[PDB]
Design a binder for this molecule. Structure first.
Ligand SMILES: NC(=O)C1=CN([C@@H]2O[C@H](COP(=O)(O)OP(=O)(O)OC[C@H]3O[C@@H](n4cnc5c(N)ncnc54)[C@H](OP(=O)(O)O)[C@@H]3O)[C@@H](O)[C@H]2O)C=CC1
Ligand SMILES: NC(=O)C1=CN([C@@H]2O[C@H](COP(=O)(O)OP(=O)(O)OC[C@H]3O[C@@H](n4cnc5c(N)ncnc54)[C@H](OP(=O)(O)O)[C@@H]3O)[C@@H](O)[C@H]2O)C=CC1
Lengths: 314, 318
């Protein structure tokens, strides 16, 4: 099951992300990758900052050798980090990724955040007081750097992540614009259905790829989470499905491309089930009523940045 | 190595926390307890809300049965959750606990947080909008319930956890006070040395028990997790090389020489052992004030779900 980006390319509605817990060995990514592939996953979401590329790349390659899948049956997304938003550093970043993955190209390249930091190896440069050392950049300048990457054939498509209405407009209403972003990858779940941004994105032919659709110290990790919501728990029993699926399907029927991950092979398989059922129109209106502007990933570490995308209503 | 509490009792300066990562089956705790026991640990920090007591109590009893340790050689701590802060519930919890652990008594009982929630089985009662159902309670009335638990012999010592200046004052300056809290168990580490709260507690014969002394980088998603991490702190990493010790160890040593009781844990037996090494070295006076200069008000455990509560302890400077 796919959908089609405003650049004529197609993308799988269900994607397996590859960001790993701080603990887990980069190597773990590789194993989980394979698992997903054998589970039917063809869409892999990764980023240069995650530092799992080289592994996610190895895994994909491995399944290419034993012919379990063809390179053109795999949609691989990579993202450019904040420390490489300066035009001249955008392409060096994508090639570097490609080098680790040993791919000729990627199927999607995103600007990870509409914010920039001091260029350098350290993905998180900081001062003597421990504060992230920001940096200003002409994003429209960065977007051109991306368009060229698409023209250079390094990526079949390009887009953005964690961009807000204005920031998206800032690019759309760009003088000279050649390619519009095919998507805005943002957190979106029943407690943050991102409708206002979703409809803006729809009225521009841009696809909203969702992450944090299930919500990722003792008290906080044991505080009621998203998949605890009774509006789900019950509705889950209704369809004899698990709440996480109810959560998944909900994002799907909205025409939202949903990402997702797990370290448990038992759950990874379970997520393909999202195609085994539909939600009544009445239930969809019920989930639309759970929203409460609960942004689980605010990117706290950025707050004082000139471009924090989450200050605006959307 | 012990230290004495203002109630005449002694407490091990090094204890093991029995909290478990959301995943790990409640059972894991048992195994982990036994492990640490066989590594020299005698102080075990626990709490009702963790639901690891019956397991932690099974490990201690098992080790008592095979003559590896005697009961009186184990300093066990429990805390009363937010949902049982009403005077008429405090003792019910403590007994509930003793039942699962199968202990005649606990060595220390603390008020887990200065905030209360809707009495009930759910430790995190919420409304139809996902918000926690707060509830007001007269802390002093609770402390009176805490004192009676002492006299009833159910606990040897009593204290508070995650209290700030004012909240401690509000207990100390309590008319008719019988037993001052023996300690204030808070989060404390090189990036949050709690110094101002530390001195106040000392000037009041209240010991300070530090948890999260190494870096949980919790609360927040993957993004925030990457932010500058402690064990990577150069000032520590270097200093560690200077004594041929691990950074975490420099961190545990730093808290000890300040008269602080430290809690710590791990799921790696290799690390649980390595911890005893905190007693094999000393940090020079100079190195001590170097680590003092690391502070940066970095609270990793804010108890975010409580922000809106009337008694959220982390708004005041301390
Ligand atoms: N562009 C951006 O800004 C961001 C992109 N992402 C992308 O999204 C991917 C995943 O998103 P993430 O933020 O982790 O959040 P998710 O919404 O995927 O939820 C995270 C948690 O879901 C749990 N889970 C998975 N399957 C099930 C199930 N069937 N039932 C119950 N719980 C389940 C997992 O637990 P367990 O591991 O124990 O199974 C995991 O910790 C990343 O790897 C990345 O590619 C993420 C954040 C930001
Ligand atoms: N009353 C309250 O409100 C609270 C009480 N607590 C108490 O404090 C206890 C411990 O505190 P906690 O917040 O967990 O924080 P800790 O500082 O104990 O962090 C625990 C982590 O330390 C890691 N670790 C242990 N030794 C080393 C080492 N030598 N080098 C590197 N990493 C190491 C472990 O990782 P790994 O497992 O990978 O080895 C483990 O996950 C709890 O179990 C609980 O009893 C905690 C929070 C709140």
């Amino acid at each position: 099951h796919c959908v089609i980006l405003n650049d004529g390319n197609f993308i799988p509605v269900l994607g397996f992300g590859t960001a790993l817990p701080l603990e887990c060995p980069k190597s773990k990514a590789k194993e989980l990758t394979k698992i997903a592939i054998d589970a039917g996953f063809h869409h892999f979401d990764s980023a240069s900052v995650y530092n799992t590329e080289d592994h996610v790349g190895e895994a994909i390659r491995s399944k290419i050798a034993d012919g379990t899948v063809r390179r053109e049956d795999i949609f691989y997304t990579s993202k450019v980090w904040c420390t490489s938003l300066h035009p001249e550093l955008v392409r060096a970043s994508l090639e570097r990724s490609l080098q680790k993955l040993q791919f000729d190209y990627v199927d999607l390249y995103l600007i990870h955040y509409p914010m920039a930091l001091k260029p350098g190896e350290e993905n998180f440069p900081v001062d003597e007081h421990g504060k992230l050392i920001f940096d200003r950049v002409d994003l429209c300048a960065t977007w051109e750097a991306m368009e060229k990457c698409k023209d250079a054939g390094l990526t079949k498509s390009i887009g953005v992540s964690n961009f807000n209405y204005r920031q998206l407009e800032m690019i759309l209403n760009k003088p000279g614009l050649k390619y519009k972003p095919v998507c805005n990858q943002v957190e979106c779940h029943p407690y943050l259905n991102q409708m206002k941004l979703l409809d803006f994105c729809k009225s521009k032919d841009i696809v909203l790829v969702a992450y944090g659709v299930l919500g990722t110290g003792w008290v906080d990790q044991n505080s009621p989470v998203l998949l605890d919501e009774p509006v789900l728990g019950s509705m889950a029993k209704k369809y004899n499905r698990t709440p996480a699926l109810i959560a998944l399907r909900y994002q799907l029927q909205r025409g939202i491309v949903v990402l997702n991950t797990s370290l448990k092979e038992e759950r990874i398989k379970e997520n393909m089930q999202v195609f085994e059922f539909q939600l009544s129109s009445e239930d969809m209106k019920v989930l639309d009523g759970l929203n409460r502007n609960m942004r689980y990933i605010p990117a706290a570490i950025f707050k004082g940045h000139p471009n924090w995308p989450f200050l605006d209503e959307y």
